[PDB]
Structures are given as structure tokens and as C-alpha cells.
Amino acid sequence: KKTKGPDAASKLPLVTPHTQCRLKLLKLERIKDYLLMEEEFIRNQEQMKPLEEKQEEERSKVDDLRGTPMSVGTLEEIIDDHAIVSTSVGSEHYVSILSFVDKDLLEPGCSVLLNHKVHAVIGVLMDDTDPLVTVMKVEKAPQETYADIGGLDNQIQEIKESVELPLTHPEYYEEMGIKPPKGVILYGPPGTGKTLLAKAVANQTSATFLRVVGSELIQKYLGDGPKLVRELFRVAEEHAPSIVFIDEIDAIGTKRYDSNSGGEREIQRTMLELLNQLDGFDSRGDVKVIMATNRIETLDPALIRPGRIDRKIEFPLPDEKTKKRIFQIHTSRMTLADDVTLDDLIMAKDDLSGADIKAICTEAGLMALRERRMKVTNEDFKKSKENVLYKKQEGTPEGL
């Protein structure tokens, strides 16, 4: 019922300075002038019409036969000449449309019009705007790019190779006749994991993306957690081949829980449906499933096997240079200071992750805005360290 959405927005995010300067001013003037010229173009084309030809052949033949009164009902079945439509209050009509028929946009389970009196379909509402049962493609192909995250070059190269084995050079193993949808099993500290998302946006630069986080220990009798994701990756194959990011459910939803029976039925269903979908002998498609976790220990032996789920990748903690790069990225938007106090905040620091880096950057601006408002607050040199302590790392009575 959903194929694509009109992407006529996000007007050139590449504003090079992202700070108020003449160059950025001039880029915006070119942006606005083009908007003015495009609007003037379309308005002049629609107003200074190519030709006046009667009632555009609309009101003469089709509009009158469509009629004034109408009602909307879903279209159920298709037959060679007629069409089988399930209208409101459970009515069912077998009529051939010939006025304003667009068979491609008609489709089963879509809203069509009924002209009353002689109830015959006369049109279709392609908008409809109610495909809301299971919605996971709403966040498809996220705009985040490689440049958003730095200092992770080894992992970026590894994931890029693992996901550019398809798309790029598919004939490579098409000739090798394997077509492996191995996916990637991602490790990493609990202080990260939404980077398991950030490193995923590198592949999200191509095709769409689906996310299943937390899901459930599929107590549902039908199960169909992984099975519905199988249907959605089939939908992804219908679309541009998407990836499935199941961070934290490859861990909990697929736990190496070591009891055998009487175990919430996910061990029976979820793990067994995961390896069926992860085996290329059952389902085709360029879909690559990114299984990311923060507990490598709970890797189920089915998930452990690289024979079906290959391309194990470990996410380590950032190094000194990586900490410098991520701090530079996060403070670039805020113009931390003119003294550039960069290395003092990370030189003695250890076990600091991306979420902590983002938090301390945000809190540095918050503390400055609190009362120390001084644009590039001269206090920021040490207040960045003041809010990098911020306690809140870990707290547990004494036991020492």
C-alpha cells in the first residue's frame, strides 16, 4: 500500500560555513533567488498556458459521469473487465471502471469513489493517507553521512566493505555464486550503541533503513517478530534494498540464554526465525542485517556461527585522536572558544564514549547559557572540564 514518498524537500543541506558569514549569506541568496525563479517559472507556465482547448476534455466526458455525489470504499479484487470493490459498511460492487481509470494506482486495498445512484467506481484517491498498521519505513535512508562521525576509520572501512560487497561489485561473488546476506555482528561498550547507529548511517547513505530495538521477548502466540521483519525486508527488496538494525535485540531478543525448554518461546521461535532469514538459501535480496550489541557474551551459538552470520566487527572505545575528532565535531556547531582548549579535556580522560562526549558538549553550552552567557564564554576553557566531571559516571554506596 506504500511504495515511495515525494522527496521535494531538504534544500541543499551543504551550507558550507553553517555560521553567519558573507559566503553563507551569499549561498542563501542564491538559494532564495532560485526559489523565486522556480516559483515564477511554474506560475508563468501554468498561467501563460500552451493552449485553451475546451474544458481540457474533463468536464465534457469524465467529470459529469463521475457525478456530484460520491462515497469512498476500499477496492478488494480485480477481474479482467470489472473490478471488485469493498465499499463502506461492508458493501461489495462488481463494476467496470472506464471513466478516469488508472489501473496502476487503483490496486487492491485502496480507497476508490462510488458515484451513488448507479453505484459504479468512477475514481480513486491515491493519497488515502491511512497506511498506519505497522510503520517502520517512516525513518528510511537517514540523512546522516560518514562525516558526522570520525576517528572510527578501521570500523568504517570494515562495515563499508561488508556492505559494498553488494551494490558495488555484485558480479564479484555473483561469479563466485554465493550471494551471502551475512550481515554484521557489532560489539561495543554500553556507553555506545547509537553509534552502532552512526556507523550504520555510512551504509544508510545508500538505500533505506529499518530499526527494531527493544521489540519484545515475543510472547505473542503467532510470534512473527522476526517473521514480520522478514516481510518488511521483502518490502525493502521491493524498495531499495534496506538494512535491518536490530541493536539490543540480537542481545536480549536473541540471548544465549542457556536454559533449553520453558524459556519464553523466543528461544524456540525468535532464534529459529532469525537464522532462517539470515541464511541466504531461504530468502534472497541485498538486505544486510546489522546485529549490534553491547554484550558479546550473550551471543547465541546460532548467532555465533560466521557460517551463516559472518563479518563480526568489534567497536572499541575511542582513542586520544578519536576523542579529539569527536569533540571537534560536537563543539564545531557551538564555537567553544577562541583559545581552542582541546587536548586538556581528553589527555587524562579514559573510558569516555560518544554519548558522554555529546552530553558534556551539550552541558557545557547549558552551563554557559545558565548565567555565564558571554558568547564564546571565556569561562568555557575550564567549564568544559567543570561539566566533564559532572559526576554521574557511576555511583554505588561504598563497597570500598
Partner 1 sequence: EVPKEKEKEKVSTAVLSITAKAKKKEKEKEKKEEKEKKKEPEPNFQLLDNPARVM
Partner 2 sequence: QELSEEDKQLQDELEMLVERLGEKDTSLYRPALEELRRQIRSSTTPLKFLRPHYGKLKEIYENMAPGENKRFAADIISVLAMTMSGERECLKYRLVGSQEELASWGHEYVRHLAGEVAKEWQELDDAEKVQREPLLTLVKEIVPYNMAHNAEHEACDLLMEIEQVDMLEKDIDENAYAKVCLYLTSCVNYVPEPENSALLRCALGVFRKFSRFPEALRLALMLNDMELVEDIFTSCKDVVVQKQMAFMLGRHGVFLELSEDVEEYEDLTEIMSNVQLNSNFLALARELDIMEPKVPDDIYKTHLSARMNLASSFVNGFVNAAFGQDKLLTDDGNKWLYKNKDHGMLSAAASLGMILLWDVDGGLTQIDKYLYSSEDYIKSGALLACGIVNSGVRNECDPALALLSDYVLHNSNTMRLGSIFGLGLAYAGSNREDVLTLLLPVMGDSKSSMEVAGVTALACGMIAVGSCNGDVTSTILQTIMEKSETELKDTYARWLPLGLGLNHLGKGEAIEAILAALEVVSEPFRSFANTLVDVCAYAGSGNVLKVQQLLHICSEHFDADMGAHQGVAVLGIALIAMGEEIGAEMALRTFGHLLRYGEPTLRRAVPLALALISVSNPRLNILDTLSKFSHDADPEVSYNSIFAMGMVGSGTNNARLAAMLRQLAQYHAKDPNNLFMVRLAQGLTHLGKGTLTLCPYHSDRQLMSQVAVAGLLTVLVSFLDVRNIILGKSHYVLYGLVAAMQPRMLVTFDEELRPLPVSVRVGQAVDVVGQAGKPKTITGFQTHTTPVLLAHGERAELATEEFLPVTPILEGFVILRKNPNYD
Ligand X SMILES: Nc1ncnc2c1ncn2[C@@H]1O[C@H](COP(=O)(O)OP(=O)(O)O)[C@@H](O)[C@H]1O
- Determine the Cα–Cα distance for residues 92 and 348; give it in Å rounded to an integer: 74
Minimal distance, residue 273 CB to partner 1, in Å? 59
Question: Is 190 labelled a binding residue?
Answer: yes
Minimal distance, residue 365 CB to ligand X, in Å? 15
Confirm or reject binding of residue 342 to partner 2 (CB under 8 A): no
Question: Is 191 labelled a binding residue?
Answer: yes
Options 87, 155, 162, 192; binder of ligand X; rule CB under 6 A: 192
Minimal distance, residue 348 CB to ligand X, in Å? 19
Q: With contact defined as beta carbons under 8 Å apart, do 199 and 155 qualify?
A: yes
137: how many CB neighbours lie within 10 A of its CB? 19
The number of residues making up the chain comes to: 400
Confirm or reject binding of residue 293 to ligand X (CB under 6 A): no
15 vs 105, which CB is nearer to partner 1?
15
Minimal distance, residue 53 CB to partner 1, in Å? 17
Beta strands 83-87 and 288-292, pairing class:
unpaired
Pinpoint the alpha helices (H) of the chain.
22-47, 62-66, 103-106, 153-164, 171-175, 195-204, 225-238, 266-278, 301-304, 320-332, 354-370, 380-389
Options 27, 82, 160, 194; binder of ligand X; rule CB under 6 A: 194
Contacts of 226 (CB under 8 A, 6+ apart): 269, 270, 273, 274, 277
Cell numbers that stand for 139 in this block: 525513518
- 169's contact among ligand X, partner 2, partner 1, none, with CB below 5 to 8 A by partner kind, is partner 2
Closest CA to 204 of 243, 236, 152, 165: 243
Options 123, 151, 166, 253; binder of ligand X; rule CB under 6 A: 151
Question: Is 193 labelled a binding residue?
Answer: yes
The region of 45-53, 114-122, 185-193, 250-258 touching partner 2 under the rule CB under 8 A is: 45-53
Confirm or reject binding of residue 335 to partner 2 (CB under 8 A): yes
- 192's contact among partner 2, partner 1, ligand X, none, with CB below 5 to 8 A by partner kind, is ligand X
- Determine the Cα–Cα distance for residues 40 and 42; give it in Å rounded to an integer: 6
DSSP for 155-208?
A: HHHHHHHHHHSSSSSSHHHHHTT------EEE---TT-SSHHHHHHHHHHTSS-
153 vs 314, which CB is nearer to partner 2?
153
Options 87, 111, 195, 270; binder of ligand X; rule CB under 6 A: 195
Question: Is 17 labelled a binding residue?
Answer: no
Which residues bind to partner 1, rule: CB under 8 A?
29, 32-33, 36, 40, 43, 47-48
Question: Is 73 labelled a binding residue?
Answer: no
Residues belonging to the binding site are 188-195
**Would you tell me which residues interact with ligand X (CB under 6 A)?**
148-152, 191-195, 197-198, 318, 326, 329, 353-355, 358
Residues belonging to the binding site for ATP are 188-195
